[PDB]
Design an enzyme around this catalytic site. Structure first.
Site, PDB file in Angstrom:
ATOM      1  N   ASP A   1       9.475 -11.140   8.958  1.00  0.00           N
ATOM      2  CA  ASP A   1       9.298 -11.840   7.636  1.00  0.00           C
ATOM      3  C   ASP A   1       8.979 -13.309   7.865  1.00  0.00           C
ATOM      4  OD1 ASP A   1       9.702  -9.656   5.925  1.00  0.00           O
ATOM      5  OD2 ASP A   1      11.823  -9.996   5.687  1.00  0.00           O
TER       6      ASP A   1
ATOM      7  N   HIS B   1      -8.414  -3.899  -1.240  1.00  0.00           N
ATOM      8  CA  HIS B   1      -7.578  -3.993  -0.046  1.00  0.00           C
ATOM      9  C   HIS B   1      -6.499  -2.897  -0.066  1.00  0.00           C
ATOM     10  CE1 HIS B   1      -5.493  -6.543   3.116  1.00  0.00           C
ATOM     11  NE2 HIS B   1      -4.471  -5.840   2.673  1.00  0.00           N
ATOM     12  N   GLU B   2      -5.742  -2.741  -1.166  1.00  0.00           N
ATOM     13  CA  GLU B   2      -4.690  -1.730  -1.199  1.00  0.00           C
ATOM     14  C   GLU B   2      -5.250  -0.325  -1.008  1.00  0.00           C
ATOM     15  OE1 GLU B   2      -1.724  -2.732  -0.786  1.00  0.00           O
ATOM     16  OE2 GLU B   2      -2.611  -4.714  -0.972  1.00  0.00           O
TER      17      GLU B   2
ATOM     18  N   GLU C   1       0.775  -1.261   0.000  1.00  0.00           N
ATOM     19  CA  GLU C   1       0.000   0.000   0.000  1.00  0.00           C
ATOM     20  C   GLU C   1       0.818   1.331   0.000  1.00  0.00           C
ATOM     21  OE1 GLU C   1       0.155  -1.455   4.454  1.00  0.00           O
ATOM     22  OE2 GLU C   1       0.208  -2.352   2.493  1.00  0.00           O
TER      23      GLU C   1
ATOM     24  N   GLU D   1      -3.979  -4.942   9.200  1.00  0.00           N
ATOM     25  CA  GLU D   1      -4.497  -5.877   8.164  1.00  0.00           C
ATOM     26  C   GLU D   1      -5.929  -6.289   8.363  1.00  0.00           C
ATOM     27  OE1 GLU D   1      -3.148  -6.168   5.469  1.00  0.00           O
ATOM     28  OE2 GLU D   1      -1.190  -5.365   5.859  1.00  0.00           O
TER      29      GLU D   1
ATOM     30  N   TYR E   1      -4.592 -11.122   9.078  1.00  0.00           N
ATOM     31  CA  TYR E   1      -5.657 -10.761   8.090  1.00  0.00           C
ATOM     32  C   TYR E   1      -6.984 -11.368   8.465  1.00  0.00           C
ATOM     33  CZ  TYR E   1      -1.783  -9.470   5.009  1.00  0.00           C
ATOM     34  OH  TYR E   1      -0.641  -8.879   4.438  1.00  0.00           O
TER      35      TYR E   1
ATOM     36  N   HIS F   1      -6.177   0.469   2.745  1.00  0.00           N
ATOM     37  CA  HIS F   1      -4.973   0.815   3.534  1.00  0.00           C
ATOM     38  C   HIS F   1      -4.686   2.316   3.534  1.00  0.00           C
ATOM     39  CE1 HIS F   1      -3.154  -2.702   5.210  1.00  0.00           C
ATOM     40  NE2 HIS F   1      -2.955  -3.313   4.067  1.00  0.00           N
TER      41      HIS F   1
END
Ligand SMILES: C[C@H](CS)C(=O)N1CCC[C@H]1C(=O)O
Ligand SMILES: [Yb+3]
Ligand SMILES: [Yb+3]
Ligand SMILES: [Yb+3]
Ligand SMILES: [Yb+3]
Ligand SMILES: [Yb+3]
Ligand SMILES: [Zn+2]
EC number: 3.3.2.6
Length: 607
Positions: A372, A292-293, A268, A315, A380, A296
């Protein structure tokens, strides 16, 4: 406590602004330049401070025209190295100074992927792109690499003149580089305060086409037309998102389609969302990733997680608005369809991690954990599941949407914790505290495994998926002749996907069922990446050797981790493909995105 950052915390001092002057050297694969940080003291008598770095070469640190002393501490593996700088004068509370740091990145920077011409579409020019989330900004420039601090920024980026630079900011002009006429300088301005993870840079042979009043799509020439059509709903989704979250404050909403190795569906970056080329299905069917993007732009980019422990806030709310955008566009039944899908995804990751694994907790303690390695669908979907449950508890979508918009307005331009969110929820719904008190908070926020309650889902669009998947599962050999291409005639692409997700959850099926499925439905011809993904996993887990070149090919021709990681893991779990999987990972490693390389390496236990 931001346990992922080694820098002075926000209580000591805060960056207010970054002025980046830098130059992209394709020959060395380094960015070289100066980061001038405007730093405000938050304490009396402040004499030194600490910044995050990772694999950076520091030439010098200049404050007020003089060089000052600094030191780099020893490497703390994935957190990088702390950089302590001695201020030349003690600062009072709220005083500001400007620290100019000359630096150079490593060609192995975990923020960056450098592509040769042959790794691009056009084959004539190299390409570079960044991915700072979560803690890779430090692998580009010294900074307080924590989402508890928000700064504005300006940048000037020198690139070979035949190339185009873009950032997560408004384009502010280009001129020839006055020190090298073979290079152009592109200028940028981000006027809205952002966490540094939202700093992004792409440099490549890029073109743009306009697709709505405040949106251009960018990609290499070969992808432009396809992308413009694929993302044509962007403005209508922007309008719906403004209705749910209030004014879009960022000016422009442009999209950049990255090369296939981009590790995620979307990132985003403000002003300029990055997306995977695996969205380009030809029918707009994967456009929920644009919803979704877009969302954000409110949840994440205006209201931000204070540390990565509270990532679900980013998220889970974004998935919650994403699914409302898709539902206003396609109907409430479709929102339910996607929500119930989301639950099955949650079931999937809980089963893959184990029901006691700490990474299935909503709020995670990332002390000594590389974000990560912790990254999954849990924040989510468990996050979405929590919001969807409260929505149902508190009297439905219209009511819970007023809370979302108030929450966004309350915490705009701030960084907040799970407790901040909960406090506001209790305050917003004061007249419903008794309902809120039935929530098992400890279980939802802090316990591993599936949430302690499952929401209510409309089943209208899901039943045909379940019905066909159950026919196949319970079918015996003498029943295979009854299946026919006509079984699919009333299923949307989303329903075909969800038929395959249901069937995948009971994999393996007998190899003869899988071959029949191919005979009657020809899933091998389908290029929709989500559908192709699940079908290839179904095939490999059912031990169809013909599927092996197909799965290896998809795993390596793109590098969206959602697809690449489960495919390699499936391929490695199959005796017949184990050795090719390890070998192909090894031959591709050098030219994979670095985070993807590391994760697939860990997944396969190679190196
Ligand atoms: C749509 C989101 C953007 S934060 C994404 O890219 N995801 C969500 C989880 C998997 C991964 C992916 O699609 O590759
Ligand atoms: Yb003082
Ligand atoms: Yb000097
Ligand atoms: Yb300007
Ligand atoms: Yb409270
Ligand atoms: Yb039978
Ligand atoms: Zn997201």
């Amino acid at each position: 406590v931001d346990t992922c950052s080694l820098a002075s915390p926000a209580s000591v001092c805060r960056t207010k602004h970054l002025h980046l002057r830098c130059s992209v050297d394709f020959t060395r694969r380094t960015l070289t330049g100066t980061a001038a940080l405007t730093v405000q003291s938050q304490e009396d008598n402040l004499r030194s401070l600490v910044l995050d770095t990772k694999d950076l070469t520091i030439e010098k640190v200049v404050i007020n025209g003089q060089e000052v002393k600094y030191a780099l501490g020893e490497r703390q593996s994935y957190k990088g190295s702390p950089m302590e700088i001695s201020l030349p004068i003690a600062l009072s509370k709220n005083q500001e100074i400007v620290i100019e740091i000359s630096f150079e990145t490593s060609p192995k920077s975990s923020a960056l992927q450098w592509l040769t011409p042959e790794q691009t579409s056009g084959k004539e020019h190299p390409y570079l792109f960044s991915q700072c989330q979560a803690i890779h900004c430090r692998a580009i420039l010294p900074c307080q690499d924590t989402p508890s601090v928000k700064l504005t920024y300006t940048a000037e980026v020198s690139v070979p003149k035949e190339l185009v630079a873009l950032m997560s900011a408004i384009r502010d002009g280009e001129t020839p580089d006055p020190e090298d006429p073979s290079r152009k300088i592109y200028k940028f301005i981000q006027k809205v305060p952002i966490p540094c993870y939202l700093i992004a840079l792409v440099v490549g042979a890029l073109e743009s086409r306009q697709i709505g009043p405040r949106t251009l799509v960018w990609s290499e020439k070969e992808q432009v037309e396809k992308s413009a059509y694929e993302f044509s709903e962007t403005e209508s989704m922007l309008k719906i998102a403004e209705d749910l979250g209030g004014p879009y404050v960022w000016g422009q909403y442009d999209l950049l389609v990255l090369p296939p190795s981009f590790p995620y569906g979307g990132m985003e970056n403000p002003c300029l969302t990055f997306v995977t080329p695996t969205l380009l299905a030809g029918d707009k069917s994967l456009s929920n990733v644009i919803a979704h993007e877009i969302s954000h732009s409110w949840t994440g980019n205006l209201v931000t997680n204070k540390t990565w422990d509270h990532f679900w806030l980013n998220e889970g709310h974004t998935v919650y608005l994403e699914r409302h955008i898709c539902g206003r566009l396609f109907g409430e039944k479709f929102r339910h369809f996607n929500a119930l899908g989301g639950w099955g995804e949650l079931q999937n990751s809980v089963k893959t991690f184990g029901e006691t694994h700490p990474f299935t907790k909503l709020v995670v303690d990332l002390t000594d954990i590389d974000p990560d390695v912790a990254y999954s669908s849990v924040p989510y979907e468990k996050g979405f599941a929590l919001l969807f449950y409260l929505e149902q508890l508190l009297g439905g979508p219209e009511i819970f949407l007023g809370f979302l918009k108030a929450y966004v307005e309350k915490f705009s331009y701030k960084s907040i914790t799970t407790d901040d969110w909960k406090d506001f929820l209790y305050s917003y719904f004061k007249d419903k505290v008794d309902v809120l008190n039935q929530v098992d908070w400890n279980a939802w926020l802090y316990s591993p495994g599936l949430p302690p309650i499952k929401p209510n889902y409309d089943m209208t669009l899901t039943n045909a998926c379940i019905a066909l998947s159950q026919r196949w599962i319970t079918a015996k050999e003498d029943d295979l002749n009854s299946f026919n291409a006509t079984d699919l005639k009333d299923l949307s692409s989303h329903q075909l996907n969800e038929f395959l997700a249901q069937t995948l959850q009971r994999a393996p099926l007998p190899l003869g069922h899988i071959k029949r499925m191919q005979e009657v439905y020809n899933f091998n011809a389908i290029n929709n990446s989500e559908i192709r993904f699940r079908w290839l996993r179904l095939c490999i887990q059912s031990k169809w050797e013909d599927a092996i070149p197909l799965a290896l090919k998809m795993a390596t021709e793109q590098g969206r981790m959602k697809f690449t990681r489960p495919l390699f893991k499936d391929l490695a779990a199959f005796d017949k493909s184990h050795d090719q999987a390890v070998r192909t990972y090894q031959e591709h490693k050098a030219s994979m995105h670095p985070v993807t390389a590391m994760l697939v390496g860990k997944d396969l236990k190679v190196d």
